[PDB]
UniProtKB/TrEMBL annotation, chain A:
Protein name: Large ribosomal subunit protein eL24
Similarity comment: Belongs to the eukaryotic ribosomal protein eL24 family.
PANTHER family for this protein: 60S RIBOSOMAL PROTEIN L24, RIBOSOMAL PROTEIN L24
Localization per record: Cytoplasm
Main location group: cytoplasm
Gene Ontology molecular function: any one: structural constituent of ribosome
Species, as recorded: Homo sapiens (Human)
Domain of life: Eukaryota
PROSITE patterns: RIBOSOMAL_L24E (PS01073)
RNA sequence: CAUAGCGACGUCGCUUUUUGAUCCUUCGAUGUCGGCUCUUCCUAUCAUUGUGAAGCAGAAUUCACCAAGCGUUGGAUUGUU
RNA sequence: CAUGGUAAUCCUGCUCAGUACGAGAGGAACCGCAGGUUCAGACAUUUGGUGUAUGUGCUUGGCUGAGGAGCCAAUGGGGCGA
RNA sequence: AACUGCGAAUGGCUCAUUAAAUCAGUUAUGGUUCCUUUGGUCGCUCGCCACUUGGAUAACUGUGGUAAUUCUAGA
RNA sequence: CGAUCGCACGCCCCCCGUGGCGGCGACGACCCAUUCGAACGUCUGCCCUAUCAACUUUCGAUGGUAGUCGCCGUGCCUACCAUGGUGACCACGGGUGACGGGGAAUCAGGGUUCGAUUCCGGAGAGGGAGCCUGAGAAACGGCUACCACAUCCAAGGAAGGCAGCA
RNA sequence: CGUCGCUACUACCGAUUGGAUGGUUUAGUGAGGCCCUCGGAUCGGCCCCGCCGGGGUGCCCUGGCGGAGCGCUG
């Protein structure tokens, strides 16, 4: 029930089982039995050993579109403010278009009179 | 990295040259492109001056020119046949600046019936009637027929190119440098070069 | 085990301290950017789906996408991956980061709530803070107010009123571009 | 300050792990050194138990008593003891 | 149970304690605790060794027409092994 | 403040290495590249946005982790 | 084969009345030329040493042919061939208390020594090696690794380069 | 003038398969970078289409939830 260990093979090493190998370069390893340690000390890659966990995972043995937008208020323009300013579609936008056009029209005529 | 220096070589007299500096960048090298045959895969590398070199990793289509009739068409590379540099490049199917390669001959044949109005690459005919018939007859007027029949006199193809058209394949030599331009242009063999290379290919096998 | 819950549709992220292994075991052996229903950590969180967006370690090392491990490894981080901004152009540095699968040894777990459930979380799902400042491109405001064609675009700008003590009142409007 | 510890000149003993002296047994043969291994025995006790004495302050050391239960090692050189 | 045999031994560290004692330098002990040496009697959970289960892979030469399956080389060699 | 561009390949220090190597003079690149400056070239191509298109990210607001750094993450 | 940024502002109005025209720049560019260069080249020139006389060539040494690679010319590298290339006119090897030159000292003339040193060229950033960006770096007051020193640490990490001025 | 005897200093030979520090290398191991062949943790687009919607008139101009087409793709 101690802190568990996993081996060369990746198997759980229950307490009181196997051996622990510490190399001179500061690395520690633990093995479940002498087969795992004889594979490790032979410098065999456990990915090419059929019964090891790494081989099982590397060969995968055993085992949509989303887009959402939301509306938020802006400092200076609340939700009601923006939703009102985006809902002049029954011809009111064309009213603003024409009224700006005519205002710019007297501006244009005043410029045309004071230019020539 | 890979150095293209000249100070790591021995002197002419055989003496050992001591370097007076470490490896500079402008004398660098890069691993060989080793162009293969397959679907197009071209890599862009940055070179000195910020310019662009195109590495051809795999190529399959190449603009080859007939030359004798001045017909240049973009055809498909089939496979490498002979390579004067290394014998091992024909095994690995590598496109280099001088290896001669078999290509598909359909554009040249198409141009030949479209311009010369004589069958080519066929055995006995009557096999592709809806197109070969209309391009063979054409029901043309006196002037166009006067053009075609005076172009008939020089409608002579060397027996080797006739045989290769019957085989449907042309063996042609690359002229560009894939891995420097990223394309595999070249020209079609004919003349003394053609039988020279054919004798070489016959010598290497059978 | 700190929890940085953050629900983007309203903002108002808050830090949460929970200390029970049973309640937060539902997160273990899950990659980041994986959406897990956070109903385990109390009744108030029922009906909620949360997304793991990353976190930090005991030593403060952040978590990076794609590492696929539980532990700390060193990566030669170039420009624009994560967890690294170059002091000068083209600079790459070897930095230590945390793998994407989450385990016990984390300090804070940054989280994103994907979908809303049945009731409101006090201080999280209420008091909607607004995004500060609106769009600056012409088409980016035309879309936002459904403008068709050059309809009074000057007067659909998001004018920003500001008020301080010594400030004589004044509204702020941005230089629209394009 | 003879006798804590030593003891000159003399003198009385014990032991047979030294070397002798002798020639009683063995010359119709008792296999002759050392080492290895293994058991047991003696105490004239090196260490350990309990003690007495000191020129025994502590520490260490020394003399003596009951005492042989247990222990008394690993190596270089040498056939060696 | 008559009788015969018999077996445990020794050391270190901590605390006592920089204490008693001693001018100082130096420097114990009793109880207690933790472990060891030598010896003895066992035992195989684990670690190691063996390994002809001639158990299972690999492999040399050869033999069965080949594949498959095998076998011989006085235990063919070798890995792992109940 | 930050994004973007540019600069940081200059200057300064030292003389360990280096004996046809560095270097000096001469000659060539018709065997190469070249930021910037300056001068040419920029309707030479027939082929439901052009009255100007899309997306993200800074700076910024907020929540933090680490003991620490010119470290950074989530929103 | 420009979806760029400022400055003064003007002209046409028939078609009309909202469009169409325009001046000074700034940024930008594929390419060409120029400038700044840079790199490899050509010829000629260097101290001491034979108690250094024969070197080079399997692992390129000299050359040819075809390629690879490099910004390009080339054994720069590969493949296939030939057997070459340099030496008493000092090759090759070793030493240098050698960075090279312009120059300094001494001064009949000829020379002999000294040039780390402010100008030109080269190299290096503790030793090596390897790279990203960029036109230009094998850059180090840029990065990666190792080696040697060495900083902090809560021991999990993190951070180094004064042969720049002091 | 030389041997011998004494005292100094200087080198030399010398068993010790002597010792130390530099430099160049064979061989083995070999970090890291670069290139290629793979790899795909994630991030977007199309096919969305369970639908309310629809206008030139069950035939969508599409203004949102939403399944996911369980594919095409970058
Ligand atoms: Mg603008
Ligand atoms: Mg006296
Ligand atoms: Mg007698
Ligand atoms: Mg006898
Ligand atoms: Mg006898
Ligand atoms: Mg006695
Ligand atoms: Mg006994
Ligand atoms: Mg066999
Ligand atoms: Mg068989
Ligand atoms: Mg037989
Ligand atoms: Mg036999
Ligand atoms: Mg075994
Ligand atoms: Mg630039
Ligand atoms: Mg020197
Ligand atoms: Mg000088
Ligand atoms: Mg200089
Ligand atoms: Mg340098
Ligand atoms: Mg450097």
């Amino acid at each position: 029930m101690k802190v568990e260990l996993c081996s060369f093979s990746g198997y759980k090493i229950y307490p009181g089982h196997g051996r622990r190998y510490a190399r001179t370069d500061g690395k520690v390893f633990q093995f479940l039995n002498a087969k795992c340690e004889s594979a490790f000390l032979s410098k065999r890659n456990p990915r090419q050993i059929n019964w090891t966990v790494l081989y099982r995972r590397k060969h995968k043995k055993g085992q949509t579109r989303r887009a959402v937008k939301f509306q938020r208020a802006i400092t200076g323009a609340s939700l009601a403010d923006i939703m009102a300013k985006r809902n002049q579609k029954p011809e009111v936008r064309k009213a603003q278009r024409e009224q700006a056009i005519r205002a710019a029209k007297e501006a244009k005529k005043a410029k045309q009179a004071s230019k020539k | 990295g890979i150095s293209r220096d000249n100070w790591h070589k021995r002197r002419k007299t055989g003496g050992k040259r001591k370097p007076y500096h470490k490896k500079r960048k402008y004398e660098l090298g890069r691993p060989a492109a080793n162009t293969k045959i397959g679907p197009r895969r071209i890599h862009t590398v940055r070179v000195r001056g910020g310019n662009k070199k195109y590495r051809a990793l795999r190529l399959d289509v190449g603009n080859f020119s007939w030359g004798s009739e001045c017909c240049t068409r973009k055809t498909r590379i089939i496979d490498v046949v002979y390579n004067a540099s290394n014998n091992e490049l024909v095994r690995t199917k590598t496109l280099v600046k001088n290896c001669i390669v078999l290509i598909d001959s359909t554009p040249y044949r198409q141009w030949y019936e479209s311009h010369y109005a004589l069958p080519l690459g066929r055995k006995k005919g009557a096999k592709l009637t809806p197109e070969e018939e209309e391009i063979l007859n054409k029901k043309r007027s006196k002037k166009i027929q006067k053009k075609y029949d005076e172009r008939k006199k020089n409608a002579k193809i060397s027996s080797l190119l006739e045989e290769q058209f019957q085989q449907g394949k042309l063996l042609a030599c690359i002229a560009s440098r894939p891995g420097q331009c990223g394309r595999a242009d070249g020209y079609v063999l004919e003349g003394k070069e053609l039988e020279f290379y054919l004798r070489k290919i016959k010598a290497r096998k059978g | 085990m700190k929890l940085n819950i953050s629900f983007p549709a309203t903002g108002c992220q808050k830090l949460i301290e929970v200390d029970d292994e049973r309640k937060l075991r539902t997160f273990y052996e899950k990659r980041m950017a994986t959406e897990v229903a956070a109903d385990a950590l109390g009744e108030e969180w029922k009906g909620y789906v949360v997304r793991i967006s990353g976190g930090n370690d005991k030593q403060g090392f952040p978590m990076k996408q794609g590492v696929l491990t539980h532990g700390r490894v060193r990566l030669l981080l170039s420009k624009g991956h994560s967890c690294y901004r170059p002091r000068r152009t083209g600079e790459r540095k070897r930095k230590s980061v945390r793998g994407c699968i989450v385990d016990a040894n984390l300090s804070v777990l940054n989280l994103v709530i994907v979908k809303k459930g049945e009731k409101d979380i006090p201080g999280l799902t209420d008091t909607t803070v607004p995004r500060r400042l609106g769009p600056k491109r012409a088409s980016r405001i035309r879309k936002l107010f459904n403008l068709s064609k050059e309809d009074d675009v000057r007067q659909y700008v998001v004018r920003k009123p500001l008020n301080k003590e010594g400030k004589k009142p004044r509204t702020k409007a941005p230089k629209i571009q394009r």
